[PDB]
RNA sequence: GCAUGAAUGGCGUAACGAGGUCCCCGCUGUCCCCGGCCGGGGCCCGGCGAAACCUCUGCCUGGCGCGCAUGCCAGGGACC
RNA sequence: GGGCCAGGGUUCCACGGCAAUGGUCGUCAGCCGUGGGUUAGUCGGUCCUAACCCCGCCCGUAACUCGGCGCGGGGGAAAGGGAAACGGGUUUAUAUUCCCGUACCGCGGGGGUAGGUGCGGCAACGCAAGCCCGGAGGGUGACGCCUCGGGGUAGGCGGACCGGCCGAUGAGGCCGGCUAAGCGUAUAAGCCCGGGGAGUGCCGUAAUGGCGAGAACCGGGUGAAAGCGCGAAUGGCCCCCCCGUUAGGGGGGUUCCGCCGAUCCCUGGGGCCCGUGAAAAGCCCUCCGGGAAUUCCGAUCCCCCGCGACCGUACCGAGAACCGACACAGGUGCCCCUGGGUGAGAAGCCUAAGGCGUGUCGGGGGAAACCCGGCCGAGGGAACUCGGCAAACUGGCCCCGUAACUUCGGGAGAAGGGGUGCCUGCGGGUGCGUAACCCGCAGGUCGCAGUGACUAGGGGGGCCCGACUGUUUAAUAAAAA
RNA sequence: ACCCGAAACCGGUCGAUCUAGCCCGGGGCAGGGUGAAGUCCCUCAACCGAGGGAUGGAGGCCCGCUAGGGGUGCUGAUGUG
């Protein structure tokens, strides 16, 4: 294979073609999952995917419908309670 | 786990000398125990890096000694303050 | 003859230049204008390991939006609040002028001149002790055992530097030393001048002995200051 | 034309496999690897311990043993007292712990 | 090489065009005095200046 | 070593390539200057009196 | 102790070594004492076909001689 | 053997040739003559930045094309980051580029719609969920080494059935039984959301472990690789029949169960650091400010139309296409990948696929002596030699057994002893299994020899030196240096 | 200064594709053995103790014609290769 594909940043799959010839398909690895800003726990409702997959989706299909979608539920509730008490 | 003297220094086999192996084993045995956390007060503190310790229950992380969470100088300054 | 290691180090070649891009950055105090006459609150966000520092470092975010990197004192807690200024309470992690620090206190990261950012007591596990306070100078005992006078307006942090006792354990392996010194690009392994050729070292020669006393004058020229430089004495003190 | 492949045959290998299944070609003189290389250690422990845990859970579900008995047998299995479910059942019958 | 720059490719093309024999009509016109030129080249023996 | 086997490692990037200014294959590519005419290092041509190379060009030696 | 010696370290030392050295079991063609066999050269035949080197030459015994001569002196041999 | 960088630069393809080249000949050729051949919105460069480098100001220098800190600008990776395409066919030579079929991304445009002015859940969350300009924050890009569990996929094996070839037109063996991107679709681990209120404690893993700072347990949310449906049989593959003077035309099939299973993918555990294992571009979300919208404005949602520039693209890729003067036994590139048997094994041996007979001079022969590379040698067994140099002994696996010394780790596979083939039947472990892998037992039997070939340690006791792993005179010194 | 021959000395320039060192970004190391810390369990007694069995995978550890790297002996062959 080419030196560019010799890199391990590509995942390689062996497939057999409908014409009966075996081919090597290379794909780019998917990113990790989003993590909470404060405690670093994984978030929910945010699909993984490379930029093209992320752009393939609508706005409401890539984040939860609640305030502060960048924090996990404990952190979201805690921040709002603190803000209300301070106010 | 059933070794009379080598302790954690048993990975070296018959190398590096008695005094070196003893001092390694003593330091590592003291470091690898479970230490009381200063926040939740439970023996669930482990070293994550040189001079950085973290509690495995409440998650509080602090800076301490290279091989022990607290040193004599730290204790002295804490009592003085 | 040929050059010495010390002579070659002065030309700043990559063999001797420090790799100041693996590190997290210098740890200097915020500008004196903020700290003088005002006291600022800050929150500790993270504590991490600096490749070449000998001490852990910490990230602090202050109430005015300024982010800074500091040497973490022993016992510092992530998420805690620290104060910098003349009115800061006497507690570990607080920075304030030496005039406001009571005697008998342990301090670190002392400023040589007001606003210079800190030069003294920065290694891991080190501290200095405040001895006496006067209207024109504050006496501090340094880790080396010297009593140095600082301007009263010089700033210092309360506590001891984290990472002490690092020398208790052996470096068991040549490979352990290899990694330790490669982290900062220090010349390792080192040769012995007595085993070089006469062209390379003053002590070089076929015989592996120095042909001259190893105490060299303080007035010797470059390329000759080897061995014990301007030594007051040598040997074991009884 | 395109000549057909000279396909290799596996008839003798099939016969040898049947004989080995019966128990032939397996003596000391036909062994080259170490006994552990032939029957790995961690894999064997995994098989046996998972089997023991499954059997204990099945017994508890069927109500043949109580919670205390299940707990005691669980710690015993972790400790490695039982090398197989046959020995586990022998222990059960011997101590009369099976209802 | 698989990947080439255009300028180098053009220079190689000029050398390739240069590498050819003298025309027979040139030989007969010159009366056999001109039979070769100094730019003749064999790929495996004489290598390009670049 | 140091002989025949050493010359087999000449398959890396060439040290010198063609120079846009003087047209000679002397352009140090890694450093970025010409070892013949000084292109990329100076505005004026690299000419030295101990060198007869620039006289050979115009048969003026 | 011609002329060792304590950090140009002294003494000892488990483990380690394509380091140096002595001995023992076993083994053997190292040896007594060398003999068979196999493949490739060597040899012959058909092709392609150089190089190092070269004052001209080119038998010996006793000699003279810049003291150790194919070439000189006296003898002896020598068909190509 | 297959794919392909760097380097080479026409060596690639067809026709016509053999004066020269080719270690011989040659009708052949990487050779000589003639004519041809490299088609991109998707693959690379182009974009970002890393180590680092350059110009301008500034300082120094007699001066500079010279040395240099700071500020401003720029460059810097064809194996780092980084929008989008895969099947079939076609040519003597190009194809992810050409033709047919089916897709995707960027920009602009047109008609609708969601929304501006909307909902379901206690919640995690499910949703098409307004437009434009500027800014801030979060996530992602974005990351070390060692070790293990779980879920898949390539490939492989055994059985049934259909077609064909060999075989006695017996048993039986082998060959084919295929399936891309794209589009729609779900769970696993992890994490989360509600109920629940434990301790003479229960719960769980391969292991470490978790619990009043909330366990057992009952419901759920989000979440990969994969599989599944369309793509898709009209395509590819095997076979059969009629026309057969060239030249052609039709009919069948291409279906299932059970295992092993990756170094190839996805996902979680755990451990180590006096060692901490990149940056920016880009992309997604949220939040703030500003600007238009009501017989109006208007999409991240469906349908459709138009446009997508420049350069590389042939070929070898090496025991003949590169470097070494060579069609050099070296080096670069073994840089990436690998059916069956035996077997622990990517070992040795045999063999399928693919390749080759060009590691390119042939013929003769008891056709010698002698030299290099191998096999055996009676009796003795180092008497040889500076010196057991060379060769020889041992050799895999199971069981028993194992010394001085010691830094207690080791020495150690010490030493030494016994067994090993094939055949006929049982027992055992995990397993649904008479699937697959592994572990014992009894009996019969042959040879000089059962790790029968291949693979495959000889051992012990004193002394000197250096603690050990490691490095050294590339080309006479590997050592106590 | 009849002609030829030196080892060497000085000036400015060219070289890290070989090789030495360091920095940035990347590829590779079949199979097996031994078994460190950590974590445990079982049986009899209990005034003390005694006797067994696991699990876990560290090492500049071990055997190894895996790949890759090195170059001790034959002072083997070749030594106008
Ligand atoms: Zn959170
Ligand atoms: Zn805690
Ligand atoms: Zn130039």
UniProtKB/Swiss-Prot annotation, chain A:
Keyword Ribosomal protein set for record: yes
Listed Gene3D superfamilies: 6.20.340.10
Keyword Ribonucleoprotein assigned: yes
One GO CC term on file: ribonucleoprotein complex
Signal peptide (residue range): none
Keyword set, alphabetical order: Ribonucleoprotein, Ribosomal protein
GO biological process, one term: translation
Molecular function via GO: structural constituent of ribosome
PROSITE patterns: RIBOSOMAL_L34E
Pfam family of the protein (one): Ribosomal_L34e
Region (Disordered), start-end ranges: 45-71
The protein's assembly and partners: Part of the 50S ribosomal subunit.
PANTHER family, sorted: 60S RIBOSOMAL PROTEIN L34
Family recorded in the similarity comment: Belongs to the eukaryotic ribosomal protein eL34 family.
Official protein name in the record: Large ribosomal subunit protein eL34
Organism: Pyrococcus furiosus (strain ATCC 43587 / DSM 3638 / JCM 8422 / Vc1)
Swiss-Prot record, chain C:
SMART domains: Ribosomal_L2, Ribosomal_L2_C
Keyword set includes Glycosyltransferase: no
Gene Ontology cellular-component annotations: cytosolic large ribosomal subunit
Keyword RNA-binding: yes
Record key words, sorted: Ribonucleoprotein, Ribosomal protein, RNA-binding, rRNA-binding
InterPro entries according to UniProt: NA-bd_OB-fold, Rib_uL2_dom2, Ribosomal_uL2, Ribosomal_uL2_arc_euk, Ribosomal_uL2_C, Ribosomal_uL2_dom3, Ribosomal_uL2_RNA-bd_dom, Translation_prot_SH3-like_sf
Location of the region described as Disordered in the Swiss-Prot/TrEMBL record: 1-20, 202-238
Compositionally biased residues, Basic residues: 221-238
Biological process per Gene Ontology, one example term: cytoplasmic translation
Gene Ontology molecular function, alphabetical: rRNA binding; structural constituent of ribosome
Signal peptide: none
Pfam families, per database record: Ribosomal_L2, Ribosomal_L2_C
Subunit (UniProt): Part of the 50S ribosomal subunit. Forms a bridge to the 30S subunit in the 70S ribosome.
PANTHER family: LARGE RIBOSOMAL SUBUNIT PROTEIN UL2, RIBOSOMAL PROTEIN L2
Functional summary from the UniProt entry: One of the primary rRNA binding proteins. Required for association of the 30S and 50S subunits to form the 70S ribosome, for tRNA binding and peptide bond formation. It has been suggested to have peptidyltransferase activity; this is somewhat controversial. Makes several contacts with the 16S rRNA in the 70S ribosome.
NCBIfam families on file: PRK09612.1
Family of the protein in this entry: Belongs to the universal ribosomal protein uL2 family.
Protein's recorded name: Large ribosomal subunit protein uL2
Curated annotation (Swiss-Prot), chain D:
UniProt feature coiled coil, ranges: none
Record GO terms (molecular function): large ribosomal subunit rRNA binding; structural constituent of ribosome
Keywords: Ribonucleoprotein, Ribosomal protein, RNA-binding, rRNA-binding
GO biological process, one term: translation
A single cellular component GO annotation: cytosolic large ribosomal subunit
Region described as Disordered: 5-39
Domain of life: Archaea
Family note: Belongs to the eukaryotic ribosomal protein eL19 family.
Function: Binds to the 23S rRNA.
Record note on quaternary structure: Part of the 50S ribosomal subunit.
Protein name: Large ribosomal subunit protein eL19
Protein's organism: Pyrococcus furiosus (strain ATCC 43587 / DSM 3638 / JCM 8422 / Vc1)
Gene that this sequence comes from: rpl19e
Interval of the full protein contained in this chain: 51 to 149 of 150
Curated annotation (Swiss-Prot), chain F:
Annotated GO biological process: translation
GO MF annotation list: rRNA binding; structural constituent of ribosome; zinc ion binding
Native source species: Pyrococcus furiosus (strain ATCC 43587 / DSM 3638 / JCM 8422 / Vc1)
Family membership: Belongs to the eukaryotic ribosomal protein eL37 family.
InterPro entries for the chain: Ribosomal_eL37, Ribosomal_eL37/eL43, Ribosomal_eL37_CS, Ribosomal_zn-bd
Zn finger intervals (C4-type): 19-37
Subunit annotation: Part of the 50S ribosomal subunit.
Residues binding Zn(2+): 19, 22, 34, 37
Cofactor details (free text): Binds 1 zinc ion per subunit.
Main function: Binds to the 23S rRNA.
One Pfam family of this chain: Ribosomal_L37e
Keywords: Metal-binding, Ribonucleoprotein, Ribosomal protein, RNA-binding, rRNA-binding, Zinc, Zinc-finger
Cofactors demanded by this protein: Zn(2+)
Protein name: Large ribosomal subunit protein eL37
GO CC annotations on file: cytosolic large ribosomal subunit
């Amino acid at each position: 294979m080419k030196p560019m594909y010799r890199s391990r940043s590509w995942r390689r799959k062996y497939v057999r073609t409908p014409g009966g010839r075996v081919v090597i398909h290379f794909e780019r690895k998917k990113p990790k999952i989003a993590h909470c800003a404060m405690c670093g726990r994984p978030l929910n409702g945010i699909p993984r995917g490379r930029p093209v997959e992320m752009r393939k989706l609508p706005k409401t299909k890539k984040r939860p419908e609640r305030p502060m979608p960048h924090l996990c539920p404990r952190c979201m509730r805690k921040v709002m309670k603190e803000q209300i008490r301070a106010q | 786990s059933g070794t009379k003297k080598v302790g954690s220094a048993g990975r070296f086999g018959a190398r590096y000398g008695l005094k070196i192996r003893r001092r390694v084993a003593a330091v590592e045995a003291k470091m690898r125990q479970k230490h009381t956390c200063p926040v939740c007060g439970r023996k669930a503190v482990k070293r994550i890096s040189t001079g950085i310790w973290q509690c495995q229950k409440c998650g509080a992380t602090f800076a301490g000694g290279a091989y022990l969470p607290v040193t004599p100088a730290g204790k002295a300054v804490r009592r003085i303050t | 003859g040929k050059s010495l290691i010390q002579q070659r180090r002065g030309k700043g070649s990559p063999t001797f230049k420090s790799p100041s891009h693996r590190f997290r950055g210098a740890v200097k105090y915020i500008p004196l204008n903020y700290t003088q006459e005002k006291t600022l609150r800050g929150v500790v966000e993270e504590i991490m390991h600096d490749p070449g520092r000998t001490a852990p470092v910490a990230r602090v975010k202050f109430e005015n939006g300024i982010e800074k990197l500091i040497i973490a004192p022993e016992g510092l807690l992530v998420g805690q609040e620290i104060y910098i200024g003349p009115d800061a309470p006497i507690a570990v992690g607080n920075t304030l002028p030496l005039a406001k620090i009571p005697e008998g206190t342990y301090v670190y990261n002392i400023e040589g001149i007001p606003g210079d950012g800190g030069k003294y007591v920065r290694a891991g596990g080190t501290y200095a002790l405040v001895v006496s306070r006067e209207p024109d100078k504050v006496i501090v005992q340094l880790p080396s055992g010297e009593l140095k006078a600082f301007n009263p307006m010089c700033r210092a942090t309360i506590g001891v530097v984290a990472g002490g006792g690092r020398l208790e354990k052996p470096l068991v392996k040549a490979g352990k030393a290899y990694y330790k010194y490669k982290a900062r690009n220090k010349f390792w392994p080192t040769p012995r001048g007595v085993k070089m050729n006469a062209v390379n070292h003053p002590f070089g020669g076929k015989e592996h002995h120095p042909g001259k006393p190893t105490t060299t004058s303080r007035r010797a020229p470059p390329g000759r200051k080897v061995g014990h430089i301007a030594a007051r004495r040598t040997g074991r003190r009884k | 034309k395109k000549k057909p492949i000279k396909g290799q045959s596996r008839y003798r290998a099939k016969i040898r496999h049947e004989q080995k299944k019966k128990g032939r070609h397996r003596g000391p003189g036909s062994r080259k690897g170490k006994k552990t290389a032939r029957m790995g250690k961690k894999e064997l422990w995994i098989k046996t311990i998972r089997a023991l845990r499954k059997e204990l859970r099945k017994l508890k579900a069927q109500k043949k043993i109580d919670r205390k008995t299940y707990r005691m047998l669980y710690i015993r299995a972790k400790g490695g007292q039982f090398k197989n479910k046959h020995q586990l059942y022998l222990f059960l019958e011997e101590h009369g712990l099976l209802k | 090489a698989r990947n080439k720059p255009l300028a180098k490719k053009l220079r190689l093309a000029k050398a390739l065009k240069q590498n050819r024999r003298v025309p027979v009509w040139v030989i007969v016109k010159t009366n056999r005095r001109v039979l070769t030129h100094p730019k003749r080249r064999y790929w495996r023996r004489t290598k390009l200046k670049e | 070593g140091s002989g025949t086997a050493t010359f087999g490692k000449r398959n890396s990037t060439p040290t010198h390539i063609r120079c846009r200014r003087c047209g000679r294959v002397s352009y140090n590519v890694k450093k970025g200057y010409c070892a013949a005419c000084g292109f990329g290092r100076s505005r004026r041509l690299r000419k030295y009196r101990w060198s007869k190379k620039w006289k050979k060009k115009k048969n003026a030696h």
